[PDB]
């Protein structure tokens, strides 16, 4: 009946979309940037080494002051560091030790974490009396928490291993909207600078652009061959980058709705775990399974440097809002600050 | 600069107070062994928990050694992402219903899952403790003409019980042959790529209560002993 006809309609729609994108593909980003002088050699060194975590580190998040940062580990601790003088401001023991993500509120009053418990927890760092305690638990996901980011002191967006993303109201602990359309597990999230949209990558090799208010999917991006592990907006909010298990990084444009450039090398055959941009968006930084981190020229696709100081898999990565330091976590339980 | 000195001193005092508690917790962390309990919906994974929402957790201690067993619940059947969280457990307990030899081909699915676990690049140092349930159900199925094993495995016909095997008294040769055939099925995956960095410890559990914890204890002891021997260039 109607079956085997909707498939045909989807086929013609996909062919039309591909034809439109091919027609809109005037040139390549390489040709226009082929006259740009190369960046050169980026040589960076470790300035700090933060010690005190027992098990491997999955996540970290910088603060907006570019001095404090939070990290999470499988030992069941959430440690808040002072990147200057390497002092531990706080250390939160978690009810569940299988944490996979953490977030730091832009105001500085809260942190969040979650993992294989299908719960997002919010911790009050500015309690009037006593110590840091848990304030709100967000329940409603049917799979593990993969990522979480604050919009403000009362709104947080989460992704889960149940193929959905959600938006929550912290005061009442209910889902404002639910974002659906992915077929694989959602692994990474990134908020736009305007805080009006966010992108996500899932275990289906596709990335989606979402609208927080309407709760709808606006664009879908393909081009990767395996699971997408990390995602990050360009500084101006018109582009983003992804890293997948096919040992490749790609740059996608929101307006052009197609991939612009590919960052790969023949020697690299391991997956990419984390990705981040520089302050000006000229340098792209990625963490791999070969224990190193590569510094890519985002405009010319050639590698410019390496941060090789970790003895195990690099799990997380981060650049300050100020832009004067990079922190790198690893499965060897060490946080390194590079400059 | 006086206020700066005061705040720096307060920062250092808080740092040392935190380091004291971290040192206290390190001792508790290093004296505990973490297990991953894995299986299927009906293969078992329940009575083992009975012996003692996104993840369950069970605590038990034998001979003043603490064990933490982590039962995965409310997770999708796609395991290739959250399985990486258990690379540093002492052992993985793989639970299989050996009676279901008649999707409905549960044994082949369990074999493929075991092969994927064994050959994963992040679990290459993790040992597996293999439990085979429903031996009574397997014996009842084999005795009757309900089904056959040759339909799904055309090699049980050319298989005979090994001499070194130790069947329990009053057990038919056919059911023992089937049990050891399944055990050798798993052992042929396990022995192909071990290289000494991890091993498999198969056991036949039928209705034993509180013996399974003793078997897990002994297998973990053997696992850690072999790691220590291998790290001292003695094995």
């Amino acid at each position, epitope marked *: 009946s109607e079956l085997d006809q909707l498939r045909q309609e989807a086929e013609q729609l996909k062919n039309q979309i591909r034809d439109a994108r091919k027609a809109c593909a005037d040139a390549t980003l390489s040709q226009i940037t082929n006259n740009i002088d190369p960046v050169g050699r980026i040589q960076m060194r470790t300035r700090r080494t933060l010690r005190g975590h027992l098990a491997k580190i999955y996540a970290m998040h910088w603060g907006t002051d570019s001095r404090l940062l939070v990290s999470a580990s499988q030992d069941g601790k959430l440690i808040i560091w002072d990147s200057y003088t390497t002092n531990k401001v706080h250390a939160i023991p978690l009810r569940s030790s299988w944490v996979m993500t953490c977030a730091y509120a832009p105001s500085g009053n809260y942190v969040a974490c979650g993992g294989l418990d299908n719960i997002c927890s919010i911790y009050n760092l500015k309690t009037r009396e006593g110590n840091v305690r848990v304030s709100r638990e967000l329940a409603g996901h049917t799979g593990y928490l993969s990522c979480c980011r604050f919009l403000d002191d009362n709104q947080i967006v989460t992704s889960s291993g149940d193929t959905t993303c959600a938006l929550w109201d912290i005061e009442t602990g209910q889902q404002t909207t639910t974002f659906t359309g992915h077929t694989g597990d959602v692994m990474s999230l990134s908020l736009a600078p305007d805080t009006r949209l966010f992108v996500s990558g899932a*275990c289906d090799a596709s990335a989606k652009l979402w609208d927080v208010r309407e709760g709808m999917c606006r664009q879908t991006f393909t081009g990767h*061959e*395996s699971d997408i592990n990390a995602i990050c907006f360009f500084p101006n909010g018109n582009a983003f980058a992804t890293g997948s*298990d096919d040992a490749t990084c790609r740059l996608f444009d929101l307006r052009a709705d197609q991939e612009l450039m590919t960052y790969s090398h023949d020697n690299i055959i391991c997956g990419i775990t984390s990705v981040s941009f520089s302050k000006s968006g000229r340098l792209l930084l990625a963490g791999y399974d070969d224990f190193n981190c590569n510094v890519w020229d985002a405009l010319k696709a050639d590698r410019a440097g390496v941060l090789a100081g970790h003895d195990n898999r690099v799990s997380c990565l981060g650049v300050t809002d100020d832009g004067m330091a990079v922190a790198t976590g690893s499965w060897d339980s060490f946080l390194k600050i590079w400059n | 600069t006086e206020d700066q000195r005061n705040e720096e001193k307060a920062q250092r005092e808080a740092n040392k107070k935190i380091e004291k508690q971290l040192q206290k917790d390190k001792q508790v962390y290093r004296a505990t062994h973490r297990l991953l309990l894995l299986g299927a919906g009906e293969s078992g994974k329940n009575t083992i928990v009975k012996q003692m929402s996104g993840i369950f957790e069970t605590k038990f201690q034998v001979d003043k050694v603490n064990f933490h067993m982590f039962d995965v619940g409310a997770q999708r059947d796609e395991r290739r992402k959250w399985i990486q969280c258990f690379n540093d457990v002492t052992a993985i307990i793989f639970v299989v219903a050996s009676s279901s030899y008649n*999707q409905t081909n549960r044994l082949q699915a369990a074999l493929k899952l075991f092969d994927s676990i064994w050959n994963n690049k992040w679990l290459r140092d993790t040992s597996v403790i293999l439990f085979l349930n429903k031996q009574d159900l397997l014996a009842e199925k084999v005795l009757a003409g309900k089904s056959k094993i040759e339909d799904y495995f*055309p090699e049980f016909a050319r298989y005979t019980t090994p001499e070194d095997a130790t069947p329990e008294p009053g057990e038919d040769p056919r059911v023992t042959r089937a049990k050891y055939f399944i055990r050798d099925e798993f052992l042929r995956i396990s022995t192909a790529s071990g290289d000494g960095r991890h091993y498999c410890y198969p056991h036949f559990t039928c209705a034993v209560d509180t013996e399974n914890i003793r078997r897990v204890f002994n297998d973990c002891r053997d696992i850690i002993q072999r790691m220590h021997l291998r790290q001292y260039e003695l094995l």
Partner: nanobody
Amino acid sequence: QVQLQESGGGLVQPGGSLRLSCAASGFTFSNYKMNWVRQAPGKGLEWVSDISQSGASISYTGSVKGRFTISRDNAKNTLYLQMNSLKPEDTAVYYCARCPAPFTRDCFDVTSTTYAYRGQGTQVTVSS
């Protein structure tokens, strides 16, 4: 985008033969392991066969070894399944699945209820 489209199949008398085909696009074929999966009516997905990146290593379920044959052509990005002899309990839909990641010896979720790297499937039935 990754596309797996199965061809071949249909209605065949018992004891007959068929040759299923699966054309792949959107990825480097040679770097991945490939499988064959099927779903009988009233049953779940079960694995049938698999082949390595080059073809040296091949496996079958016990019910199809000696009769079915799996081959791959990396030059033309096609996966084959020669179904030499058929039985009435071979009526199902056949899907060509792909390994989640390249350069790996393990295939985790190729038989789950939902999986992003599987094909549409072709109905194969034998009745009389």
